[PDB]
Amino acid sequence: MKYIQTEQQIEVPEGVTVSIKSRIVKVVGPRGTLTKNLKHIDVTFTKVNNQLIKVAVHNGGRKHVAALRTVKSLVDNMITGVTKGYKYKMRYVYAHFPINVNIVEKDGAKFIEVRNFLGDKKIRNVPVRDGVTIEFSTNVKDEIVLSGNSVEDVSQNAADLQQICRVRNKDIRKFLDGIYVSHKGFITEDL
Amino acid sequence: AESHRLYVKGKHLSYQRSKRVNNPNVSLIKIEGVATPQDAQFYLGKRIAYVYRASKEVRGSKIRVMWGKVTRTHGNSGVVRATFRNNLPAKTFGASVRIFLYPSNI
Amino acid sequence: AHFKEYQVIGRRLPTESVPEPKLFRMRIFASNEVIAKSRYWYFLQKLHKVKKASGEIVSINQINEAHPTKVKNFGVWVRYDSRSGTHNMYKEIRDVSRVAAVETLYQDMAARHRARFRSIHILKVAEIEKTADVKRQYVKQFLTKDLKFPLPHRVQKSTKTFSYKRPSTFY
Amino acid sequence: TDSIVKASNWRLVEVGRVVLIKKGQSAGKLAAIVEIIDQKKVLIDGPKAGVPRQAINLGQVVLTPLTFALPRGARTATVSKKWAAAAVCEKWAASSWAKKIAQRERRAALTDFERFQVMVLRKQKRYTVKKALAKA
Amino acid sequence: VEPVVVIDGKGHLVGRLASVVAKQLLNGQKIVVVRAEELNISGEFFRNKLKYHDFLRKATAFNKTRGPFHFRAPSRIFYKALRGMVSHKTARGKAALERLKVFEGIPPPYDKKKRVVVPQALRVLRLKPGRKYTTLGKLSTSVGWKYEDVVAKLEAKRKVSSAEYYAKKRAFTKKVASANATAAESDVAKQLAALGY
């Protein structure tokens, strides 16, 4: 119905300063810097009080205003990822074969090396994407932890590890072996 | 000076025509700087010359002229109709013609 | 075409048994004089036992509304034919005059429900004298206090076919 | 440091914005937006320049940076009083916008003779300018 | 009003540009189009890739050599659109196509000549904001064009030398602008301003 004006509010915490280009967005924080291209949304930004930055669409339709909240949730996860950080925990599920996972190096490319999945002789190599650090957490049996600033890079690398261990030519309802995300929180949790 | 031009530039567009039939008795002319029938009304009745060269001298020159004049406007975009004493060849679609200022109403 | 509001008054032809007929009146939106008389006969035959031959038109008077400058908000009721059935409808048009509201309605129906002039009945056109008596959102939107908005991405129309600099859409 | 966001503010429409009529009977006169009808057309008034009150599409006008205070629904009498109070007429004239238009209308009115003074003066001014552009 | 018109094709719709240019040639105007690889076609890249593949399956069954030719260059894709808007089979139509040159990137001497645009074919003015568009360079590469990297390299070089030319130009036009300001408020300038100059 071509809403005249709809807008959202992006809260800016004390420790970060949001520097927005024409539509290029850069967030700087204690944990680092993040950048994003937003030229495909056709929105406008404006700063109110150096702690709150508005984004608005004028004369927007159903899909145009739907993309408005998406932009707010993208920059918000950009600010959140550089203040608290994003940490994803995955467990290993297996019935008979212990899933052997290690961090290896191939010409300095930081591949994740997965062995013995359902007794397979195949080695599944998952590159570790830049900005995501991975450590095998102790005090928990068969857990892996992925963490970084950007949620999009962290979640994709977590999804890529889960995706590479899909079981084929079997009843996956019975054969449940694989690596699955059990938690999605923040590095600086309960600060 | 550098410029000695006393005529308005113009191009020979086509004959008067339907999509399958044309009338070679009427020619269509575009005048530079003319975009409306209101503006084109100033050049109605002006003398139009088509100047071309040839390898044969006839009466003391190698330049021949096909004289004409502007009769009326054509369309909404400043094109005008012209009729010449002899019909224009139609090899000259997109050739340039000279729209002189005489006869004058200024 | 561009519409005009006429009042049309007609009656059955007088006779010795019953002279002085009832002089029914009806408001018609039409482009010209002949259509206004026609639509009156069309609609009157739907209510009363009368037709053009068995009655007469006594008067026609074009109605042009009092305030061609004050902006109104009109509630409009219609009755239109779809490809499968006949349906009633109610909408608002916010504009400056009564006739321009109907001119908007006919285009609006033709654009959303493909309803042409023949298959539309305009039931009544009334002003919504009170704000907050508006029930549809697309006209309720413009009634806020200190309404203001930009017009981004302005496109200039060029006279010449060739431009010597890349156009800019600031506004 | 400080967070910076490019303002991106551009000629929003409201009651009081001054517009310039592009095409129609007026075609070049100033008018003020009085009421907002819909997103594509508004009611304007041009009483100082002779423009009457009428609804017009926003594609028939161009907004100007000039603006002033009108109450919503201002009739012809009060727009005239607020137009003189806000001094919109010479504020428009002082702008480079109206000067280029006045430049074009002056260049169109130049007779053949006074187009001969222009070339003579321009060659004189060219002599002084290019002389100055030989030592810097 | 111009011997040769050179068009910056970047940010143009291929069909509207083809129509505008096609009329220009039929009216006797010589046209050069450069930077064909940055031309746009309205519609998502997937849509335009399927259209070319549907075009790609049309060939003479018994001899593919005499069949329709599927030209893959961005300049050739624009040329095909323009050829359909012209009676290319007649002598006048062949004469029109001689008044046309389409280039990929900005080659020599056209690299030091003014480029114009056609606003009625420009993408930022024609298309509604948010609509998806295809770039001819990307589309050409997917169907067999080989020189995306060559052209990009030669435009990186060309734009560097072009920015060098402009930086000198801005310095000189500042120097001239300062002189005109000093030469202003002179009695000669006052009379010029009275006449609109």
Place this chain on the structure above:
RNA sequence: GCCAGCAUCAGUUUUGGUGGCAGGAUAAAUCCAUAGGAAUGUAGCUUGCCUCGGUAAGUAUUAUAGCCUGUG
């Protein structure tokens, strides 16, 4: 003799500028005067807490803006 230019005309036609009238609710409007009303509530007042002054809500029907409707 052949081909043209200009002027004054006649017939046919195409395109502009401009004058006087007649209608209509003897256009409706704008404008002027008067009465009443309301908020997308102007001034003023009060309350709340503020970078000493503007916010936020309550009152307030023209006041340091105005608007609507009727009648003439």
Place this chain on the structure above:
RNA sequence: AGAACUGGCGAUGCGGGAUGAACCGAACGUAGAGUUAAGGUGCCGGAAUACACGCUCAUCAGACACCACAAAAGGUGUUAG
């Protein structure tokens, strides 16, 4: 395949429906000027990339009677009731 009334083709060109005995317009000596019909006006192609309100994005869109096909049944696609 077989009839009724009327109009046509046969026996008929011309403008239009790209194309077509039958549709639409209009029927014809040789020419000139003007104006139109039906159909059209991005380019081919003569004629507004006219003006105005809306709707539609289609990973087989749609695009003008005769006519050159598509149905039932479905869709928080989107719009108005």
Place this chain on the structure above:
RNA sequence: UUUGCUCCACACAAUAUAGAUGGAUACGAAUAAGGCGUCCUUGUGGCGUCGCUGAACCAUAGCAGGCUAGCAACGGUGCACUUGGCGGAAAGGCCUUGGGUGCUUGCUGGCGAAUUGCAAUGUCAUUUUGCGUGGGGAUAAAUCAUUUGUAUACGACUUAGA
């Protein structure tokens, strides 16, 4: 092969024109953003300004643009030389140093125009080729025929032969 070929200058002819009749006048990028000016702590910076079309800018006066005189500045332009660079995407053009030369409408003077008769494109462009001069520059191959078989219906192919 009876003086042939190529390049340079003008000398006259022939030839032809998809169509000069002042200038094709050079950032890139974005368009829900930019251009320019200025300042600093050189940035995704601050401040100011501009667009709303090239309807611009430049050029533009003189016998189709003549012949002379003076004044003011030391600039502007064309031309043949010359110094140094840059450009390979189809560069074949762009910038620059020095001197010479013509003009200069930056300003003020003197002489000439007529008769093409009341308009007649009223002829000023560039394409190619040829014949002449005078001034340099350099002195080959291919095919047929014979021959080979890595080839072959014939052509064609591949070899050899002072």
